[PDB]
Amino acid sequence: LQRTLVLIKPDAFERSLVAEIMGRIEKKNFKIVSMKFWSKAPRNLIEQHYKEHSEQSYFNDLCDFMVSGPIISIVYEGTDAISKIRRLQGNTNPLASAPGTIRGDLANDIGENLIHASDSEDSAVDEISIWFPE
Amino acid sequence: LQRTLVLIKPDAFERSLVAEIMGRIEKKNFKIVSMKFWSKAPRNLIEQHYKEHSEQSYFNDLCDFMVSGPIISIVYEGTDAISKIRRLQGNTNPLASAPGTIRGDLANDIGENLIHASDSEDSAVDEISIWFP
Amino acid sequence: LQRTLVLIKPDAFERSLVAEIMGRIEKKNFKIVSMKFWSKAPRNLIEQHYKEHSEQSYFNDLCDFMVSGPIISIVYEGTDAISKIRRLQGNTNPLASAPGTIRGDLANDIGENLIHASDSEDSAVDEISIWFP
Amino acid sequence: LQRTLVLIKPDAFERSLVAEIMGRIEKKNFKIVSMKFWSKAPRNLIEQHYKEHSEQSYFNDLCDFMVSGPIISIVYEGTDAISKIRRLQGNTNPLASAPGTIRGDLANDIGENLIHASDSEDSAVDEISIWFP
Amino acid sequence: LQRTLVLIKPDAFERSLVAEIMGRIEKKNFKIVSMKFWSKAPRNLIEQHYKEHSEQSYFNDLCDFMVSGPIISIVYEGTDAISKIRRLQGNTNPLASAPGTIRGDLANDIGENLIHASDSEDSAVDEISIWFPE
Amino acid sequence: LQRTLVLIKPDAFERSLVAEIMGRIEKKNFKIVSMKFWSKAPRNLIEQHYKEHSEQSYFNDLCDFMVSGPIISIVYEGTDAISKIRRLQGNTNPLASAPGTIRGDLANDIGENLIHASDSEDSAVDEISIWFPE
Ligand SMILES: Nc1ccn([C@H]2C[C@H](O)[C@@H](COP(=O)(O)OP(=O)(O)O)O2)c(=O)n1
Ligand SMILES: Nc1ccn([C@H]2C[C@H](O)[C@@H](COP(=O)(O)OP(=O)(O)O)O2)c(=O)n1
Ligand SMILES: Nc1ccn([C@H]2C[C@H](O)[C@@H](COP(=O)(O)OP(=O)(O)O)O2)c(=O)n1
Ligand SMILES: Nc1ccn([C@H]2C[C@H](O)[C@@H](COP(=O)(O)OP(=O)(O)O)O2)c(=O)n1
Ligand SMILES: Nc1ccn([C@H]2C[C@H](O)[C@@H](COP(=O)(O)OP(=O)(O)O)O2)c(=O)n1
Ligand SMILES: Nc1ccn([C@H]2C[C@H](O)[C@@H](COP(=O)(O)OP(=O)(O)O)O2)c(=O)n1
Ligand SMILES: [Mg+2]
Ligand SMILES: [Mg+2]
Ligand SMILES: [Mg+2]
Ligand SMILES: [Mg+2]
Ligand SMILES: [Mg+2]
Ligand SMILES: [Mg+2]
């Protein structure tokens, strides 16, 4: 039993795909443990969430995009939730993400890619603490 | 432009219909402006939410049901959001709710009925202050 | 709590709408308690099922249609199942069936209308004994 | 058997609901007999299409909206296609359109309302000749 | 043209996924040849169906689960139906079943995995005879 | 930014899968640039579209099938649209096309396979000129 951190990104709201994405995880039988709606996340939270990317050329565009509309942060719980939700998410790159995955069916850009999911136990703990410090 | 308060009820979690219900409202172009997940809503909030029914025969069972699993409280915004979302919701009574409505398609019980929606401007304002004080 | 008899008609097989129709009833939380697949229903069962219409102008065409492909006969159980599933079904006449109903959304003919549902307690009991003797 | 003229409006493209809308009509078993994609419809065609509304207060905004993005014009064929597709469409006014209808489920504005459908035999014939001369 | 045996398992009924699963096979254009609804299958039928697993540690839990609610048995017919329905089904293991498959989208446990499908011509013949001995 | 040529084939009309297929491409955020409905495409257009297959044993059956009912021709535009729509389409062979793809979920025959999509920049230019010579 693991918990992972998922963000629904501002592009899902712009495109009205919030329920679609959440529904895919719900149908796979993962349970919401906590959830927060952000009309706009503070840039500092975003910078912390993506701290590993601070030296990448896309860092600033990525932070601007993540504060460009609402976000929902969600903690999901389930056996092997971290790896499983990552497989449902699909690859970052639109040339690679597989039909059947969230990104494979729905996303067409490497940046506006609808959804974040923690990639490991270490990072899940970290990201959960950022979005749900309580 | 109006704001209305929606609760996703514990039966929606139990039957995995949370996204289905939220999706119907999202597809109608209504925007979330607040949302809170409650693993278990406090009895007192529930009793205040339904204070109008406090002397009704079904009150205790209603309150018991409403604390029997998680709920999501959401404020939705849109032109005439209150009446329009009430229309989406459908009649409380499963003998009357129309196919095409949330309850008409999905609910089979007058009590386990998936969703709450504010029924007027004044009750919307009240319910919003209960869930998002 | 009631039991009702539903037939999935041959047009549903032809148009691949079997799961779509059964899904609408399943999503309304009704439970299957019996079900039989008929690659081709016997003429006599069909004629007994529709015995009330035996002198109607459409009887032979109705019976011919009903043996023109497979059918599934299902008994569904739930509180007020009879009237509620009738409500899901929609009006026989495609000029009257409401969007949101099975027929309102999917059927375009008064005859090729996808689904049978028992119309009362007494007819439910009768139809159930025909298909599941 | 009848032919009716449907326009998929620019809001459907903007909100990615083109297939959703066409799908509802396809599932009702209506057949496309003509279809044209317009990256931008000519003002004059739009003004002729809505010539009945030319003196209405909303005319210019309506025409402006209708040239604000792509449209698809489609001729659909089926028994009683005109009235049946009008029934699928739903009321212009989002306070009145029924859940289960295209507008009842998807539209939130009296103007940005996703779809046009001919309202009678005579207007169908007229509209068809405008879009498919 | 082949026939394969499919079981809709008790978890599909518990979770109201019966139509969802049948719909996926129906949309792929496979035809129902026979179908039986079981309010509860007799344990002996289950033990016969899973006879190859009789010495596995999960055998008894598997039999208990399969008699824990209803089952629908179905014979589907179509060109290469056996291998094709297996690919739609998805892998047994939730760490492996691919998004887009029935198990990949819907199942989250190696045991409660919604659906059985015959894995070969030899086993299809066998399983069809168990569920439809006529 | 690329344009690709898609045909919705007569089997999609016969099976009422037109919107289903178009919807999958629409949901991936590709834009229609041009579109033409053909009550029946002229056999010569079909023969030109499939000119590379003229010596294959299936050539005549393929042309007969393509004129057997309506077709919609569509030009779709988007970053890497050609390769991306090909991945959504799925493999020609029903023993290979993956669940989650259009063919993987919906097609059960190597010939009646619902959808054409250009396979390269060179062929897209070519096919666009055939269906939209303007
Ligand atoms: N080449 C890249 C890589 C990442 N990004 C953005 C989009 C990604 O969601 C975030 C984080 O990248 P990461 O490599 O962790 O990708 P995932 O979101 O976990 O799939 O950065 C980008 O815009 N361009
Ligand atoms: N006869 C009744 C009436 C109401 N309830 C429960 C179910 C209802 O959602 C709540 C509130 O009742 P109300 O009449 O306000 O109905 P709505 O939720 O607005 O449709 O009480 C009940 O269990 N039995
Ligand atoms: N005018 C009519 C009336 C009925 N039928 C056929 C189609 C109907 O499903 C059956 C049974 O008619 P009935 O009036 O009982 O209609 P329902 O199936 O209950 O809606 O007869 C017909 O073909 N033409
Ligand atoms: N009060 C109104 C009435 C109509 N319009 C626009 C929206 C409508 O689709 C068109 C045509 O009006 P009409 O009354 O024919 O309505 P329908 O499209 O047939 O439902 O005009 C408007 O913007 N405001
Ligand atoms: N490690 C395992 C393997 C199988 N089972 C159960 C679940 C499987 O559906 C059945 C039969 O296993 P099998 O290896 O034939 O798997 P499939 O159902 O064909 O994918 O046994 C289990 O509970 N744990
Ligand atoms: N063995 C084959 C190969 C192709 N065809 C038909 C079906 C294919 O859609 C067309 C064109 O074949 P091609 O190899 O280009 O396949 P795609 O449509 O691009 O996947 O020919 C066939 O009937 N049998
Ligand atoms: Mg990452
Ligand atoms: Mg109330
Ligand atoms: Mg009747
Ligand atoms: Mg009008
Ligand atoms: Mg096996
Ligand atoms: Mg090719």
Side-chain angles (χ1 to χ4, degrees):
Chain A
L1 210 75
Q2 289 177 337
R3 285 169 179 188
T4 188
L5 182 288
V6 162
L7 304 173
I8 310 298
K9 298 186 183 178
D11 54 336
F13 292 84
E14 181 59 36
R15 289 175 63 204
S16 311
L17 290 174
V18 177
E20 167 70 34
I21 295 155
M22 287 176 75
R24 289 165 176 242
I25 300 167
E26 186 179 11
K27 280 167 177 183
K28 180 90 172 159
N29 219 7
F30 293 105
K31 297 318 173 191
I32 297 173
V33 163
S34 328
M35 182 167 51
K36 253 269 263 167
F37 171 82
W38 304 77
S39 56
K40 53 169 152 276
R43 180 179 290 267
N44 187 266
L45 223 70
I46 296 304
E47 296 181 352
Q48 288 314 292
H49 180 87
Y50 286 125
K51 61 181 167 290
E52 281 149 327
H53 301 261
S54 65
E55 312 317 309
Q56 306 300 301
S57 80
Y58 55 79
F59 185 67
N60 209 245
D61 288 345
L62 168 67
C63 296
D64 285 347
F65 161 67
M66 293 292 287
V67 303
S68 79
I71 278 171
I72 290 164
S73 52
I74 311 177
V75 179
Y76 281 110
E77 172 182 82
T79 299
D80 294 299
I82 295 158
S83 68
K84 285 167 180 181
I85 289 163
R86 287 282 281 173
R87 290 187 68 235
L88 295 179
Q89 179 187 221
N91 192 267
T92 327
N93 194 326
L95 298 172
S97 59
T101 69
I102 296 164
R103 289 167 169 181
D105 293 339
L106 304 172
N108 202 29
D109 185 81
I110 194 152
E112 304 183 354
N113 59 35
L114 300 164
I115 173 168
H116 170 88
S118 308
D119 67 1
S120 73
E121 296 195 280
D122 286 11
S123 58
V125 168
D126 218 14
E127 299 165 4
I128 297 182
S129 78
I130 290 169
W131 294 91
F132 296 92
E134 320 84 32
Chain B
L1 210 78
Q2 263 178 356
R3 283 176 186 205
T4 195
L5 179 291
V6 164
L7 307 176
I8 305 306
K9 297 184 178 179
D11 55 333
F13 289 85
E14 178 65 25
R15 297 170 64 202
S16 304
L17 290 172
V18 175
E20 166 71 33
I21 296 162
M22 291 180 65
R24 287 166 179 242
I25 296 164
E26 185 175 16
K27 284 177 184 181
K28 183 68 162 177
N29 207 208
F30 290 107
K31 306 298 178 199
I32 301 165
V33 298
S34 299
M35 178 172 45
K36 195 173 173 327
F37 170 80
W38 307 79
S39 59
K40 188 187 188 178
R43 187 82 180 208
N44 62 336
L45 284 190
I46 289 306
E47 298 189 359
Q48 161 124 284
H49 183 81
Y50 285 121
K51 77 179 69 82
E52 261 42 58
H53 311 263
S54 66
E55 313 308 309
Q56 300 296 307
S57 57
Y58 54 77
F59 187 66
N60 291 343
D61 287 347
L62 163 63
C63 289
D64 283 349
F65 165 63
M66 288 295 285
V67 301
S68 79
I71 70 174
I72 289 167
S73 62
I74 314 157
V75 182
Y76 279 111
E77 175 172 82
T79 178
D80 279 297
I82 299 162
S83 71
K84 292 176 177 171
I85 284 172
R86 286 283 280 179
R87 187 89 207 260
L88 259 22
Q89 175 184 222
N91 198 296
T92 327
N93 194 315
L95 296 167
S97 56
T101 66
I102 293 167
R103 293 166 165 174
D105 288 343
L106 309 175
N108 207 25
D109 188 68
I110 190 160
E112 297 176 359
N113 61 32
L114 297 170
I115 173 171
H116 171 84
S118 306
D119 70 4
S120 66
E121 312 186 303
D122 294 331
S123 67
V125 172
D126 296 350
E127 295 170 0
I128 288 167
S129 71
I130 295 170
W131 296 96
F132 301 89
Chain C
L1 210 78
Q2 263 178 356
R3 283 176 186 205
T4 195
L5 179 291
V6 164
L7 307 176
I8 305 306
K9 297 184 178 179
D11 55 333
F13 289 85
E14 178 65 25
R15 297 170 64 202
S16 304
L17 290 172
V18 175
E20 166 71 33
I21 296 162
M22 291 180 65
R24 287 166 179 242
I25 296 164
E26 185 175 16
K27 284 177 184 181
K28 183 68 162 177
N29 207 208
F30 290 107
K31 306 298 178 199
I32 301 165
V33 298
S34 299
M35 178 172 45
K36 195 173 173 327
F37 170 80
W38 307 79
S39 59
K40 188 187 188 178
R43 187 82 180 208
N44 62 336
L45 284 190
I46 289 306
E47 298 189 359
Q48 161 124 284
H49 183 81
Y50 285 121
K51 77 179 69 82
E52 261 42 58
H53 311 263
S54 66
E55 313 308 309
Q56 300 296 307
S57 57
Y58 54 77
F59 187 66
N60 291 343
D61 287 347
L62 163 63
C63 289
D64 283 349
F65 165 63
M66 288 295 285
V67 301
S68 79
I71 70 174
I72 289 167
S73 62
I74 314 157
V75 182
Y76 279 111
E77 175 172 82
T79 178
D80 279 297
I82 299 162
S83 71
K84 292 176 177 171
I85 284 172
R86 286 283 280 179
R87 187 89 207 260
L88 259 22
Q89 175 184 222
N91 198 296
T92 327
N93 194 315
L95 296 167
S97 56
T101 66
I102 293 167
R103 293 166 165 174
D105 288 343
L106 310 175
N108 207 25
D109 188 68
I110 190 160
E112 297 176 359
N113 61 32
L114 297 170
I115 173 171
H116 171 84
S118 306
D119 70 4
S120 66
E121 312 186 303
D122 294 331
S123 67
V125 172
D126 296 350
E127 295 170 0
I128 288 167
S129 71
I130 295 170
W131 296 96
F132 301 89
Chain D
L1 210 78
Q2 263 178 356
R3 283 176 186 205
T4 195
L5 179 291
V6 164
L7 307 176
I8 305 306
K9 297 184 178 179
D11 55 333
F13 289 85
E14 178 65 25
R15 297 170 64 202
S16 304
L17 290 172
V18 175
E20 166 71 33
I21 296 162
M22 291 180 65
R24 287 166 179 242
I25 296 164
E26 185 175 16
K27 284 177 184 181
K28 183 68 162 177
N29 207 208
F30 290 107
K31 306 298 178 199
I32 301 165
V33 298
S34 299
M35 178 172 45
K36 195 173 173 327
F37 170 80
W38 307 80
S39 59
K40 188 187 188 178
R43 187 82 180 208
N44 62 336
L45 284 190
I46 289 306
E47 298 189 359
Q48 161 124 284
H49 183 81
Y50 285 121
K51 77 179 69 82
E52 261 42 58
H53 311 263
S54 66
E55 313 308 309
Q56 300 296 307
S57 57
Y58 54 77
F59 187 66
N60 291 343
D61 287 347
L62 163 63
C63 289
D64 283 349
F65 165 63
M66 288 295 285
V67 301
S68 79
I71 70 174
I72 289 167
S73 62
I74 314 157
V75 182
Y76 279 111
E77 175 172 82
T79 178
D80 279 297
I82 299 162
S83 71
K84 292 176 177 171
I85 284 172
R86 286 283 280 179
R87 187 89 207 260
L88 259 22
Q89 175 185 222
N91 198 296
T92 327
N93 194 315
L95 296 167
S97 56
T101 66
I102 293 167
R103 293 166 165 174
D105 288 343
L106 309 175
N108 207 25
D109 188 68
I110 190 160
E112 297 176 359
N113 61 32
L114 297 170
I115 173 171
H116 171 84
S118 306
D119 70 4
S120 66
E121 312 186 303
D122 294 331
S123 67
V125 172
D126 296 350
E127 295 170 0
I128 288 167
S129 71
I130 295 170
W131 296 96
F132 301 89
Chain E
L1 210 75
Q2 289 177 337
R3 285 169 179 188
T4 188
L5 182 288
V6 162
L7 304 173
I8 310 298
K9 298 186 183 178
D11 54 336
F13 292 84
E14 181 59 36
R15 289 175 63 204
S16 311
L17 290 174
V18 177
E20 167 70 34
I21 295 155
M22 287 176 75
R24 289 165 176 242
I25 300 167
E26 186 179 11
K27 280 167 177 183
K28 180 90 172 159
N29 219 7
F30 293 105
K31 297 318 173 191
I32 297 173
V33 163
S34 328
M35 182 167 51
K36 253 269 263 167
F37 171 82
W38 304 77
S39 56
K40 53 169 152 276
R43 180 179 290 267
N44 187 266
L45 223 70
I46 296 304
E47 296 181 352
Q48 288 314 292
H49 180 87
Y50 286 125
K51 61 181 167 290
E52 281 149 327
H53 301 261
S54 65
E55 312 317 309
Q56 306 300 301
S57 80
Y58 55 79
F59 185 67
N60 209 245
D61 288 345
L62 168 67
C63 296
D64 285 347
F65 161 67
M66 293 292 287
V67 303
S68 79
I71 278 171
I72 290 164
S73 52
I74 311 177
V75 179
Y76 281 110
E77 172 182 82
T79 299
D80 294 299
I82 295 158
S83 68
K84 285 167 180 181
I85 289 163
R86 287 282 281 173
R87 290 187 68 235
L88 295 179
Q89 179 187 221
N91 192 267
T92 327
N93 194 326
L95 298 172
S97 59
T101 69
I102 296 164
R103 289 167 169 181
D105 293 339
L106 304 172
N108 202 29
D109 185 81
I110 194 152
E112 304 183 354
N113 59 35
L114 300 164
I115 173 168
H116 170 88
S118 308
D119 67 1
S120 73
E121 296 195 280
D122 286 11
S123 58
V125 168
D126 218 14
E127 299 165 4
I128 297 182
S129 78
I130 290 169
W131 294 91
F132 296 92
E134 320 84 32
Chain F
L1 210 75
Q2 289 177 337
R3 285 169 179 188
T4 188
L5 182 288
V6 162
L7 304 173
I8 310 298
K9 298 186 183 178
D11 54 336
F13 292 84
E14 181 59 36
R15 289 175 63 204
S16 311
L17 290 174
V18 177
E20 167 70 34
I21 295 155
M22 287 176 75
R24 289 165 176 242
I25 300 167
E26 186 179 11
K27 280 167 177 183
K28 180 90 172 159
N29 219 7
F30 293 105
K31 297 318 173 191
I32 297 173
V33 163
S34 328
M35 182 167 51
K36 253 269 263 167
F37 171 82
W38 304 77
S39 56
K40 53 169 152 276
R43 180 179 290 267
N44 187 266
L45 223 70
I46 296 304
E47 296 181 352
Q48 288 314 292
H49 180 87
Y50 286 125
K51 61 181 167 290
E52 281 149 327
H53 301 261
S54 66
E55 311 317 309
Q56 306 300 301
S57 80
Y58 55 80
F59 185 67
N60 209 245
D61 288 345
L62 168 67
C63 296
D64 285 347
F65 161 67
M66 293 292 287
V67 303
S68 79
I71 278 171
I72 290 164
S73 52
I74 311 177
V75 179
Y76 281 110
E77 172 182 82
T79 299
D80 294 299
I82 295 158
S83 68
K84 285 167 180 181
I85 289 163
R86 287 282 281 173
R87 290 187 68 235
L88 295 179
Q89 179 187 221
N91 192 267
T92 327
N93 194 326
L95 298 172
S97 59
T101 69
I102 296 164
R103 289 167 169 181
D105 293 339
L106 304 172
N108 202 29
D109 185 81
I110 194 152
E112 304 183 354
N113 59 35
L114 300 164
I115 173 168
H116 170 88
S118 308
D119 67 1
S120 73
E121 296 195 280
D122 286 11
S123 58
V125 168
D126 218 14
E127 299 165 4
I128 297 182
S129 78
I130 290 169
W131 294 91
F132 296 92
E134 320 84 32

